[PDB]
Design a protein around this ligand. Structure first.
Ligand SMILES: Cc1nccn1Cc1cccc(C#N)c1
Length: 211
């Protein structure tokens, strides 16, 4: 095993094959411990989950400092934090996976290249290299800074995202809200008038597929 695994891929190769909470260490530094949820089953596992929607119990209409730091219950609905995402994606070349489920239907999106810039970039999104079944709804968002109501799409849709004008993805939107663009949306799968029951966003090294 590795003593200070820097993501869920290094924690999995540590032979831990059960999904759940694991400690990772940013840059492999024992002083930068972070508790994460590892999805060890989806497409080979080793995924850090950074967003989960499943029941509408958690409030996602939260401010910049909350989106920077992270919030929620890692075992249920939560947001990992933009500072964490910046520090993880800085460690190497990461891939994004999005898993969606609604009334028994599932879809997914993978982006071969995924990064989140630091606070001086207002946590700029990079997403490239789409494959999957959900439809490429992140392309619209590529290169955009993060937006919250206090730093306006976040206000208009009462959510937070790498908003443009405004969204094709709104996975931090209002749970079960089928009103146009208000809900947990992935436009090129279920449009803007259908809030998705279950959503996870997760990341791991892009080279994991053949390591
Ligand atoms: C540890 C801590 N103190 C304040 C904010 N955070 C970050 C946080 C909170 C809840 C869930 C996640 C995840 N994943 C991250």
């Amino acid at each position: 095993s590795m003593p200070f695994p820097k993501d869920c891929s290094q924690a999995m190769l540590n032979g831990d094959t059960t999904s759940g909470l694991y400690t990772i260490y940013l840059n492999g530094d024992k002083a930068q411990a972070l508790e994460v949820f590892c999805d060890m089953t989806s497409d080979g596992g080793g995924w850090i989950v950074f967003l989960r929607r499943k029941n509408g119990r958690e409030n996602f209409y939260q401010n910049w400092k909350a989106y920077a730091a992270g919030f929620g219950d890692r075992r249920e609905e939560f947001w990992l934090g933009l500072d964490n995402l910046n520090k993880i994606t800085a460690q190497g070349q990461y891939e994004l996976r999005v898993d969606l489920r609604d009334h028994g239907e599932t879809a997914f999106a993978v982006y071969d290249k995924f990064s989140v810039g630091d606070a001086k970039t207002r946590y700029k999104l990079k997403v490239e290299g789409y494959s999957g079944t959900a439809g490429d709804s992140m392309a619209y968002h590529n290169g955009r800074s993060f937006s919250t109501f206090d730093k306006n799409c976040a206000l208009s849709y009462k959510g937070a995202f790498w908003y443009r004008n405004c969204h094709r993805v709104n996975l931090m939107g209002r749970y079960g809200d089928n009103n146009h663009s208000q809900g947990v949306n992935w436009f090129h799968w279920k449009g803007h008038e259908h809030s998705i029951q279950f959503a996870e966003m997760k990341l791991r090294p892009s080279n994991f597929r053949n390591l």
